[PDB]
Amino acid sequence: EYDLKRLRNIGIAAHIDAGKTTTTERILYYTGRIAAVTTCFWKDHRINIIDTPGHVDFTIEVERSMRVLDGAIVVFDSSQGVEPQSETVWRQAEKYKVPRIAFANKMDKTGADLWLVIRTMQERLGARPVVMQLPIGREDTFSGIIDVLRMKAYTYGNDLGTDIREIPIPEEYLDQAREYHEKLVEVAADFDENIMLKYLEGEEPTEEELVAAIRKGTIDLKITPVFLGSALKNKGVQLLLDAVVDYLPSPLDIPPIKGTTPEGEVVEIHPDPNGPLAALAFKIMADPYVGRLTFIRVYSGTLTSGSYVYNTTKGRKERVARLLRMHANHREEVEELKAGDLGAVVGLKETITGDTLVGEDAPRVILESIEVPEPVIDVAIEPKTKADQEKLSQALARLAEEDPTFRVSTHPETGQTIISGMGELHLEIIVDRLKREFKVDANVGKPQVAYRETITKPVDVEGKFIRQTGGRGQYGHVKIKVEPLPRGSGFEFVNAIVGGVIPKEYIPAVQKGIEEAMQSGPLIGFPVVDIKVTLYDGSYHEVDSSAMAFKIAGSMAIKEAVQKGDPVILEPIMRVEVTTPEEYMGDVIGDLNARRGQILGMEPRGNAQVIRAFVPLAEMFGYATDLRSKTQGRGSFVMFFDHYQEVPKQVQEKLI
Numbered sequence: 001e002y003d004l005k006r007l008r009n010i011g012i013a014a015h016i017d018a019g020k021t022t023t024t025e026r027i028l029y030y031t032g033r034i035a036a037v038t039t040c041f042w043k044d045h046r047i048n049i050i051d052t053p054g055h056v057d058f059t060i061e062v063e064r065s066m067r068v069l070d071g072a073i074v075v076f077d078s079s080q081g082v083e084p085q086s087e088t089v090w091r092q093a094e095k096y097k098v099p100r101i102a103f104a105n106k107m108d109k110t111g112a113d114l115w116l117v118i119r120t121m122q123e124r125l126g127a128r129p130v131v132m133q134l135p136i137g138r139e140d141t142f143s144g145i146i147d148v149l150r151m152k153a154y155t156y157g158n159d160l161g162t163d164i165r166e167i168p169i170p171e172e173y174l175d176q177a178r179e180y181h182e183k184l185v186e187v188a189a190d191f192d193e194n195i196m197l198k199y200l201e202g203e204e205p206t207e208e209e210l211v212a213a214i215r216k217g218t219i220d221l222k223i224t225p226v227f228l229g230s231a232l233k234n235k236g237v238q239l240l241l242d243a244v245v246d247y248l249p250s251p252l253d254i255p256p257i258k259g260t261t262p263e264g265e266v267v268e269i270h271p272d273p274n275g276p277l278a279a280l281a282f283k284i285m286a287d288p289y290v291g292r293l294t295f296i297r298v299y300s301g302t303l304t305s306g307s308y309v310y311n312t313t314k315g316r317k318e319r320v321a322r323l324l325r326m327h328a329n330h331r332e333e334v335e336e337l338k339a340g341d342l343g344a345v346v347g348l349k350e351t352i353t354g355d356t357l358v359g360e361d362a363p364r365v366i367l368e369s370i371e372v373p374e375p376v377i378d379v380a381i382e383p384k385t386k387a388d389q390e391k392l393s394q395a396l397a398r399l400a401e402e403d404p405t406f407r408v409s410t411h412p413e414t415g416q417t418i419i420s421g422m423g424e425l426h427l428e429i430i431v432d433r434l435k436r437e438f439k440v441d442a443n444v445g446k447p448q449v450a451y452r453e454t455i456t457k458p459v460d461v462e463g464k465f466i467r468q469t470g471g472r473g474q475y476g477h478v479k480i481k482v483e484p485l486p487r488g489s490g491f492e493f494v495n496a497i498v499g500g501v502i503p504k505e506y507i508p509a510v511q512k513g514i515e516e517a518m519q520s521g522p523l524i525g526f527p528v529v530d531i532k533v534t535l536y537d538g539s540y541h542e543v544d545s546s547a548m549a550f551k552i553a554g555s556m557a558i559k560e561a562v563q564k565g566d567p568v569i570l571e572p573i574m575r576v577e578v579t580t581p582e583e584y585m586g587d588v589i590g591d592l593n594a595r596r597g598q599i600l601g602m603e604p605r606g607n608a609q610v611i612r613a614f615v616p617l618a619e620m621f622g623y624a625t626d627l628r629s630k631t632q633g634r635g636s637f638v639m640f641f642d643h644y645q646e647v648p649k650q651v652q653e654k655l656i
């Protein structure tokens with residue numbers, strides 16, 4: 001009941017509204033005649049369907065979901081062929097070196113041309129797609145599908161899937177069918193030698209030869225077999241399954257994952273159920289009654305239900321209580337989860353999305369990197385009126401655990417809770433996450449940028465404090481030397497008091513006091529970073545001095561002594577991989593250098609052209625729509641924070 005050669009772990013990446021969701025939903029209907037990844041069966045093959053992100057912008061989620069799957073299907077709204085975003089989604093496919101096939105959906109829709117896809121496929125996606133099926137009909141006249149591979153046709157009596165009759169191709173669509181059979185074998189002959197020789201001598205190859213050959217090609221990334229249908233009208237979907245088994249890869253065709261030994265050495269993990277074990281927990285999905293199910297693709301070895309696996313990313317052991325394969329209607333308990341297969345685990349306390357798992361006495365291989373995002377997008381948030389402040393921070397509790405990658409901070413002045421993250425969308429999703437499924441309605445603020453502040457020249461000034469007989473005598477007096485530290489060298493304190501000049505007891509306050517003003521730079525009101533303070537002189541009032549009057553004695557000096565060291569804003573200067581069609585280069589490169597950018601290289605990937613840059617995050621708000629407009633939607637870009645840098649003189653002056 002387990003042959004690695006019969007699995008087929010696949011995804012469904014479509015432009016929104018192409019039918020990512022409606023194709024799957026109709027894919028289960030046909031499979032199930034007997035939710036992250038959702039196993040199922042078609043002619044003696046298992047087909048674990050990983051879920052690919054909703055919006056294809058999701059990059060990181062996308063990265064994962066990619067890594068987790070073997071084959072993949074692209075769904076094209078056959079109104080517009082490869083859609084602008086369906087164009088962008090192909091980019092991701094191209095990237096992660098994943099074999100695939102394509103689905104012309106909506107052939108009933110008014111606006112139903114196949115060739116439209118084919119043309120703008122090779123034309124816009126550099127695909128060299130191959131035609132395997134020809135419609136019988138056009139719009140709402142669409143009556144079937146021809147398989148030019150096997151030279152037969154299927155018909156569809158009703159818009160249901162109740163009626164599918166195998167019919168010999170109509171005399172009408174015959175001369176077209178024959179031309180494309182040939183033209184195809186010309187692509188099969190491109191892979192099999194025995195096929196060419198039979199094309200020439202005029203011999204008909206064999207269905208296997210054909211399909212066998214076409215498969216090497218689909219797989220080895222040299223084509224993209226192309227079928228069509230309407231998932232709405234329930235036609236050609238079966239074929240699409242007959243496709244997947246035929247062309248889409250088992251976990252044995254795709255290459256082994258690049259895993260990293262702890263010594264640095266990066267070795268390759270070969271799909272072997274009877275060897276050391278490792279897996280990837282990509283999806284921490286919170287079930288109802290069962291609890292924290294974490295979803296895992298297994299690469300080597302076997303997962304036994306009731307065992308002790310090692311969370312290699314965190315470092316703590318985990319116990320696998322039950323092993324689940326979630327199906328279309330119901331769950332499933334299993335004892336094994338072998339290699340190349342996918343599923344759900346029960347237990348695993350401290351295991352988050354991405355964490356790698358290996359088994360007890362097994363090599364500690366990590367599969368995912370170590371990216372801890374520098375916090376760059378600050379967002380301010382009052383509750384509704386402290387009716388929703390209740391379930392505000394108690395809401396962050398669940399959110400924090402399963403995702404480490406975001407600050408939470410109460411802002412100095414306004415006391416507004418402040419959420420510090422990576423990207424913009426990263427933050428926006430949580431608003432919908434909170435103002436809806438968390439029942440935390442409230443007052444939101446515009447994304448801000450993580451400006452930090454610092455000095456440049458070394459200063460040397462004090463910070464007294466006097467409030468005598470109010471209510472009992474109060475007093476305290478510091479004298480400090482501050483100098484600027486190198487970038488992202490952060491804080492350093494030094495105590496060079498001679499002795500006795502200030503009481504030993506009261507230093508903590510001076511420190512607690514410095515630390516409290518470094519949350520408010522004089523330039524805007526952002527955390528002062530990169531500095532070296534030195535307490536060296538002072539005075540005290542023997543009775544009047546107190547833990548309060550030296551917290552203030554000290555705060556009054558870090559505040560004051562900043563506005564003297566020629567203060568300076570620093571800003572987040574990002575790193576960008578913008579994907580533009582080769583035609584819009586001279587156009588958007590201009591866009592970067594308008595946003596104080598500094599272009600680095602340009603290296604080709606696919607029919608496209610990618611460009612590495614140094615735009616200030618400060619100049620990035622709305623860059624999506626500005627590039628979607630300059631590439632007519634064809635563009636796409638990704639950020640990866642790089643460093644903090646100074647702001648130029650004219651940049652600062654305006655910053656108030």
Ligand SMILES: Nc1nc2c(ncn2[C@@H]2O[C@H](COP(=O)(O)OP(=O)(O)O)[C@@H](O)[C@H]2O)c(=O)[nH]1
Nearest residue numbers: 015016017018019020021022106109230231232
């Ligand atoms: N004409 C036509 N419309 C479809 C078909 N499949 C899906 N749709 C429409 O696609 C829209 C959204 O598709 P959806 O399942 O949400 O795809 P997704 O947005 O990419 O996940 C729905 O409003 C459907 O009516 C099809 O085969 N033919």
Ligand SMILES: [Mg+2]
Nearest residue numbers: 017020021054
């Ligand atoms: Mg959808």
